[PDB]
Amino acid sequence: MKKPMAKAYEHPYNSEHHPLNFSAVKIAETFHDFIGPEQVSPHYESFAMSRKFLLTFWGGFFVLNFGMATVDLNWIMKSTYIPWIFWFQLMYFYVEGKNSMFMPLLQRFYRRAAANEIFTMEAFYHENIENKLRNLMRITKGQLEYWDIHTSYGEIRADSI
Amino acid sequence: LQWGSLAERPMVDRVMSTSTWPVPYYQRLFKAYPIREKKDKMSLLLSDIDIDDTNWYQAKDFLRGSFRGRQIVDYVENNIASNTYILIQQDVANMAKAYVHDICG
Amino acid sequence: LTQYVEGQIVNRNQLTLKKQEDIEQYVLKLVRGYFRTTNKQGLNINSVLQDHGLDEFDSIELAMQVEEDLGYVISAETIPVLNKVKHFVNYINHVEQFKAENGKAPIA
Amino acid sequence: ATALYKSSALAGNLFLYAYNYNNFTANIRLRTMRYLFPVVSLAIFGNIYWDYRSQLVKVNLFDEYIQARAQELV
Amino acid sequence: QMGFSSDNPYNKRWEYKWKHSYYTYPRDYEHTEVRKPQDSKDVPPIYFAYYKDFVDRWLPGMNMWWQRRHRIFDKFNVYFLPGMSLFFYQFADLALGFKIMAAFPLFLAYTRIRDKTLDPDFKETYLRDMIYQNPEITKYFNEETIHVLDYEFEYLPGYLCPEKFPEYQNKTWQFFNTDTAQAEGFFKFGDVESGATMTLKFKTMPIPGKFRYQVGEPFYFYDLRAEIKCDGVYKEVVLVDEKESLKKIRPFLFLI
Amino acid sequence: GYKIRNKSIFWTRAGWKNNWHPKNFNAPRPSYGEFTMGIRCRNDHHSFLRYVQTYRNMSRHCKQYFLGDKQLEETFILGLRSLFLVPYDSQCLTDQIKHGGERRFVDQLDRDFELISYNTHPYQLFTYTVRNEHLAWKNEQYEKIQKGEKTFEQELLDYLDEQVLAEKAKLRDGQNFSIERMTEIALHVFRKARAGKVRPAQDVRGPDGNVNDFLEQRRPFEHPNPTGVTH
Numbered sequence A: 001m002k003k004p005m006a007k008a009y010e011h012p013y014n015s016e017h018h019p020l021n022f023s024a025v026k027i028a029e030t031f032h033d034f035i036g037p038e039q040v041s042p043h044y045e046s047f048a049m050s051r052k053f054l055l056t057f058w059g060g061f062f063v064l065n066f067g068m069a070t071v072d073l074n075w076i077m078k079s080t081y082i083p084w085i086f087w088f089q090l091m092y093f094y095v096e097g098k099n100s101m102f103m104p105l106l107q108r109f110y111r112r113a114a115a116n117e118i119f120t121m122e123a124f125y126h127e128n129i130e131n132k133l134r135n136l137m138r139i140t141k142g143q144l145e146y147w148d149i150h151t152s153y154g155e156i157r158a159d160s161i
Numbered sequence B: 001l002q003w004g005s006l007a008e009r010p011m012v013d014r015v016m017s018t019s020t021w022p023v024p025y026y027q028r029l030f031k032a033y034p035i036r037e038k039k040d041k042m043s044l045l046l047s048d049i050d051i052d053d054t055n056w057y058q059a060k061d062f063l064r065g066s067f068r069g070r071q072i073v074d075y076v077e078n079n080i081a082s083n084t085y086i087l088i089q090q091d092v093a094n095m096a097k098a099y100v101h102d103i104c105g
Numbered sequence C: 001l002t003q004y005v006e007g008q009i010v011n012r013n014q015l016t017l018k019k020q021e022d023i024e025q026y027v028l029k030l031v032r033g034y035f036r037t038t039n040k041q042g043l044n045i046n047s048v049l050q051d052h053g054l055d056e057f058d059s060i061e062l063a064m065q066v067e068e069d070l071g072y073v074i075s076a077e078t079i080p081v082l083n084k085v086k087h088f089v090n091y092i093n094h095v096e097q098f099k100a101e102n103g104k105a106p107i108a
Numbered sequence D: 001a002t003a004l005y006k007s008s009a010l011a012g013n014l015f016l017y018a019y020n021y022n023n024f025t026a027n028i029r030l031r032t033m034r035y036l037f038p039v040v041s042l043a044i045f046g047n048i049y050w051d052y053r054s055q056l057v058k059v060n061l062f063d064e065y066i067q068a069r070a071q072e073l074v
Numbered sequence E: 001q002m003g004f005s006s007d008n009p010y011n012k013r014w015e016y017k018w019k020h021s022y023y024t025y026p027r028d029y030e031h032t033e034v035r036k037p038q039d040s041k042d043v044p045p046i047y048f049a050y051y052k053d054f055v056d057r058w059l060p061g062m063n064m065w066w067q068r069r070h071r072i073f074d075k076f077n078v079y080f081l082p083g084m085s086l087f088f089y090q091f092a093d094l095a096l097g098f099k100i101m102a103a104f105p106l107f108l109a110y111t112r113i114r115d116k117t118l119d120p121d122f123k124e125t126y127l128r129d130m131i132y133q134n135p136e137i138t139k140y141f142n143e144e145t146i147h148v149l150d151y152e153f154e155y156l157p158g159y160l161c162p163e164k165f166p167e168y169q170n171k172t173w174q175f176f177n178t179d180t181a182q183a184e185g186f187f188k189f190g191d192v193e194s195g196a197t198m199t200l201k202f203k204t205m206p207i208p209g210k211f212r213y214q215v216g217e218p219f220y221f222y223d224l225r226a227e228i229k230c231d232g233v234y235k236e237v238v239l240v241d242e243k244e245s246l247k248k249i250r251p252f253l254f255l256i
Numbered sequence F: 001g002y003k004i005r006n007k008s009i010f011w012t013r014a015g016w017k018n019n020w021h022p023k024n025f026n027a028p029r030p031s032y033g034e035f036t037m038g039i040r041c042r043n044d045h046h047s048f049l050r051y052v053q054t055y056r057n058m059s060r061h062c063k064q065y066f067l068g069d070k071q072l073e074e075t076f077i078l079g080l081r082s083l084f085l086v087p088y089d090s091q092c093l094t095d096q097i098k099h100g101g102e103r104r105f106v107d108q109l110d111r112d113f114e115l116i117s118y119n120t121h122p123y124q125l126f127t128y129t130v131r132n133e134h135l136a137w138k139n140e141q142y143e144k145i146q147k148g149e150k151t152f153e154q155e156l157l158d159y160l161d162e163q164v165l166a167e168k169a170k171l172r173d174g175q176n177f178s179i180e181r182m183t184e185i186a187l188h189v190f191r192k193a194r195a196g197k198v199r200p201a202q203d204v205r206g207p208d209g210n211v212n213d214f215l216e217q218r219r220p221f222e223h224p225n226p227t228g229v230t231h
């Protein structure tokens, strides 16, 4: 065995923690390091459903806390009336009215349907790629049939003489 | 070095676990990936690529590791009239005619 | 003048052919040394590079090797016309004749 | 307090460059940041020190006047 | 001679024509051989992109103007246009129209300098179409086996012989032009298939065509000669003879 | 597995699977010499020679950091050709691209070479990383051979060679030891050898033959869960 090379080139400005070039993959790793891994719960019921009475207390505590702190809550309610009416009457059709009136506006639905089909393709990735290889394995085995014929030529020549 | 029993499978395949009541409600969303290391595993991109130049190039690399393989490589690259190293057999013309020239004796 | 060879710095040497018999031997050794060349012994002076598994891009790599061995500076306009062993021999002759007559290298 | 904060925010930019030195230096897509970071840093330092230096001169002009004017009135 | 020339070693006759999609310039000039990692300088110094644009775009553009500075030294560009600009510059504060009338002759001067200092570019596809129609050339040369050994094409300085071209002894034309707008050069060719070489010498001049004021062809080959050399055969092909060409057509005498 | 059912999936307003000339309103229209005064166009006939020079540049400027590795230079050439042969082999009719496919691909490769000249192209950094891991594994095999020791790859081959002899000594009715049978023998050894890397072989039980490894285990005291709560 020949002695291989000691090492290839080592870039002086590229590291695994500080990659030189940018992509969403490295941002994805730094993102999941930040939010941390999936917080797996070992319990048999969720935290919210087991503490509905207690969460109701603190929920109303902070409502009263804000209510006791906000002496002028009626001024905030009245100052919010006009924008509440305005933005809801203006955006009603584009949010909800389109579903039973003049136009459907199915742009957002088309993107869900495309993703649902892509989700299904990824679910059958193993089956689809395995069917593609079976055709390539069929072609590869068809080429290997020639070496099997030549190996027996010596036996044919021996018995022919 | 020890190899164990060829008839048996790894113990990971034989170990099992069963459930009971109560059962954890939590449904796993993703597989954990705490350390980004996937060494000694080949890329899954190398899946259904057709035959190409990398096949005869890597063949010579592995053949040249043996004595008989070194003879095949040197003979093919020198004494075979082919316009490509991507050898495809679609006929037995060169095979049959090479046999009739040898079986006469 | 020095280049890395398998991790070791080795001084590169240049050739000066100035003879028809030496140019043919160099080109054959050049083309046979290429890892994509098929039927290396069937290669002769009148051999089309296409018949030995070589395309337009392989002629660029061969022309690049001629610049390494002979010190030429071959323009991009000349490379695509080198498709036979005879073409490399005649081009090398034309470059030596040009420098022997004009005292300078051809335009690159 | 203002001069000390803005000095620390400028030092924070120097850390951001040092933390990302290899990208700012080798990646040519960040060449403009590499070339013009010191120009902006000098302009930022120039504003921090200018305000401090001008305030220092005015305080000294104020202190020397009230002392001189007070002795005249005495 | 090519006016636009950088330290790049390859493709000298195409340097001004090729429009690269580079954001900035390459770190090094095109290598002539495989180099070592320590031959080139990692992370080029700060303000490298600005330096490259000055030495690869600005500087060779000024060397082009300097090389052909003799074609812009006419009494129109030297005295009339700057003299007109100074007359209106004295009233630049009176109104806006004086600023425009003082800057227009400057922009007009730049355009004449910009066009006259460019490399003389003939329609090379017309030329190769002409030499490949000759049977004596196609016997030894073909487009698929021809290669360029040397190229030269430059304007002729001053006014020519005032017997072969009496057109240029015109005081009105000499006021705008200091040269004759004619060019001369050659082409060193070689054929890798036949082993033959030839020197394609040519002389060009602008001619009028089919219209009253517009030039027909700025580079018309009125003399085209080929000295073909082979193994033991030396042929001399005359595609366009000047004695027969100058009796039919005369130069154009560009103004402005 | 799963096939796209929409028969109009590859339909475009320009035809079936047309990704070379998408249909837009401002369509290309001809020009006439007699009627045209002036024109501003950037198209020329310089793309062919720019295609040749770009290859020479990208090939030579990358070999600068190969340290003379001959096998890496030949591997890079095969990879560089796959990048230049895209317009010649693609399903897309590259000769029918909207405004000249030759110019478009040439300008695309120039952007790649610009990054190559600075040794910052992601293909270059990927080649250095892949080659360093490969040479480290070849140097490991070389240092074990210089010591007279047997490599892990040689022990697999010798173990596979003896299993073939055992399986063919019992195969007398049939005499076709197909490549299918050889493969499943090697794959079964591979699965046990792969599981043996995480759990080495201590005794006759072999690689990953201990049931006690799969009993309840806990993190060591010096390496607790760093990212989340344990309870």
Ligand SMILES: CCCCCCCCCCCCCCCCCC(=O)OC[C@H](COP(=O)([O-])OCC(O)COP(=O)([O-])OC[C@@H](COC(=O)CCCCCCCCCCCCCCCCC)OC(=O)CCCCCCCCCCCCCCCCC)OC(=O)CCCCCCCCCCCCCCCCC
Pocket (backbone or CB within 6 Å): A046, A047, A048, A049, A055, A058, A059, A060, A062
């Ligand atoms: C000095 C004295 C004062 C201090 C004293 C100390 C007091 C400290 C108080 C803290 C209390 C302990 C903290 C424990 C955790 C927080 C409490 C909790 O409920 O979390 C469990 C709950 C999930 O627990 P789980 O059951 O284990 O999860 C199982 C499934 O995975 C969950 O998902 P699933 O879909 O699979 O399962 C069903 C799911 C269905 O429920 C949901 O999934 C909720 C859907 C909402 C998500 C939709 C997207 C909207 C949010 C996007 C992100 C916004 C934030 C980021 C953007 C801005 C960046 C700043 O869960 C439920 O069944 C119902 C959930 C609970 C009832 C509804 C909760 C309403 C109030 C909580 C949210 C408060 C919002 C802000 C209001 C406060 C003003 C700031 O967490 C949440 O749902 C989100 C809340 C995250 C915490 C933020 C709020 C912290 C403080 C909350 C205090 C109590 C509420 C006070 C206000 C009440 C107003 C009405």
Ligand SMILES: CCCCCCCCCCCCCCCCCC(=O)OC[C@H](COP(=O)([O-])OCC(O)COP(=O)([O-])OC[C@@H](COC(=O)CCCCCCCCCCCCCCCCC)OC(=O)CCCCCCCCCCCCCCCCC)OC(=O)CCCCCCCCCCCCCCCCC
Pocket (backbone or CB within 6 Å): A102, A103, A104, A105, A106, A107
């Ligand atoms: C050229 C476009 C129109 C221009 C006219 C002016 C603008 C329209 C104003 C009135 C709107 C009514 C028509 C609904 C249009 C909905 C289109 C839509 O929203 O996109 C959905 C669409 C996908 O959602 P989709 O659910 O599949 O759409 C189907 C619809 O849901 C529904 O499915 P569909 O198949 O039935 O839709 C086909 C489309 C067919 O449209 C056409 O083919 C156009 C007609 C041919 C050309 C005629 C115009 C000729 C112009 C030249 C003459 C101008 C002279 C000016 C002076 C000369 C100047 C030199 O709509 C019609 O059928 C129109 C017939 C109207 C029925 C009238 C029946 C009687 C009603 C009586 C009561 C009326 C009460 C109305 C209350 C007030 C209005 C709310 O998104 C896109 O296509 C994105 C690309 C945008 C396309 C180009 C821009 C067109 C305008 C789109 C809005 C802005 C999008 C961009 C921003 C996106 C966010 C960043």
Ligand SMILES: CCCCCCCCCCCCCCCCCC(=O)OC[C@H](COP(=O)([O-])OCC(O)COP(=O)([O-])OC[C@@H](COC(=O)CCCCCCCCCCCCCCCCC)OC(=O)CCCCCCCCCCCCCCCCC)OC(=O)CCCCCCCCCCCCCCCCC
Pocket (backbone or CB within 6 Å): A017, D008, D009, D011, D012, D013, D014, D015, D016, D018, D019
């Ligand atoms: C509710 C609590 C509220 C409390 C308030 C405080 C909240 C906490 C704040 C925490 C954030 C600040 C952290 C401060 C230090 C804390 C210790 C620590 O970092 O964690 C342990 C940390 C380990 O982190 P880990 O979480 O365990 O794991 C790291 C991961 O594995 C991955 O490793 P990795 O290295 O990639 O991770 C880096 C890691 C830690 O990386 C570090 O090494 C921390 C370096 C922080 C320096 C911040 C700028 C200071 C500039 C230096 C000034 C020196 C003046 C000296 C004057 C006299 C000398 C001439 O993360 C950071 O970089 C944190 C930086 C936070 C962003 C700051 C950017 C500010 C820009 C925006 C301006 C905002 C205005 C405020 C600016 C205030 C400036 C004073 O330990 C180390 O990193 C050891 C480092 C040993 C070598 C460093 C030798 C010194 C080199 C200094 C840089 C020189 C730059 C050029 C000079 C510029 C001025 C001329």
Ligand SMILES: CCCCCCCCCCCCCCCCCC(=O)OC[C@H](COP(=O)([O-])OCC(O)COP(=O)([O-])OC[C@@H](COC(=O)CCCCCCCCCCCCCCCCC)OC(=O)CCCCCCCCCCCCCCCCC)OC(=O)CCCCCCCCCCCCCCCCC
Pocket (backbone or CB within 6 Å): E069, E070, E073, E078, E079, E080, E082, E083, E086, E087
């Ligand atoms: C403290 C540190 C910083 C200090 C900074 C300040 C210092 C700056 C220093 C600047 C001075 C040195 C730079 C120039 C050195 C050149 C020396 C030399 O020997 O060159 C000879 C060299 C000849 O080379 P050669 O081929 O070896 O000669 C062979 C034979 O001798 C050739 O034989 P030939 O018979 O063919 O003769 C050829 C020759 C013929 O030469 C001549 O015959 C001389 C003609 C000059 C005419 C100038 C007046 C034009 C108007 C007269 C009109 C009078 C009639 C009408 C009167 C109406 C009154 C309203 O051609 C020329 O060289 C003339 C070229 C153009 C010159 C005229 C440029 C006009 C600019 C107008 C604005 C002036 C502002 C000045 C600043 C004052 C205010 C701040 O020519 C050159 O190298 C040309 C260089 C490039 C042209 C430079 C001219 C300036 C261009 C800049 C454009 C902007 C102008 C200013 C505009 C500002 C307001 C917008």
Ligand SMILES: CCCCCCCCCCCCCCCCCC(=O)OC[C@H](COP(=O)([O-])OCC[N+](C)(C)C)OC(=O)CCCCCCCCCCCCCCCCC
Pocket (backbone or CB within 6 Å): E015, E016, E017, E018, E019, E020, E057, E058, E061, E062, E065
């Ligand atoms: C009166 C005192 C002097 C007045 C101030 C003069 C300032 C002139 C410089 C600032 C304006 C420059 C214009 C920028 C926009 C164009 C960029 C450009 O030039 O591209 C080059 C272009 C490059 O050509 P291109 O842009 O068409 O592209 C080349 C084609 N490819 C890409 C295919 C290769 O060339 C030219 O335009 C011709 C030369 C123009 C010369 C520019 C001005 C030089 C002036 C020299 C003054 C020297 C004395 C002063 C300094 C002395 C030392 C202190």
Ligand SMILES: Nc1ncnc2c1ncn2[C@@H]1O[C@H](COP(=O)(O)OP(=O)(O)OP(=O)(O)O)[C@@H](O)[C@H]1O
Pocket (backbone or CB within 6 Å): E017, E121, E122, E123, E124, E125, E126, F039, F040, F041, F042, F043, F044
């Ligand atoms: N038929 C045309 N239609 C549209 N634009 C054109 C046309 N011909 C030229 N152009 C543009 O005008 C420029 C000059 O054309 P020109 O013929 O001088 O180029 P050239 O490279 O010198 O050709 P040649 O090699 O034959 O001499 C071209 O770069 C092009 O952008």
Ligand SMILES: [Mg+2]
Pocket (backbone or CB within 6 Å): E121, E122, E123, E124
């Ligand atoms: Mg031209």
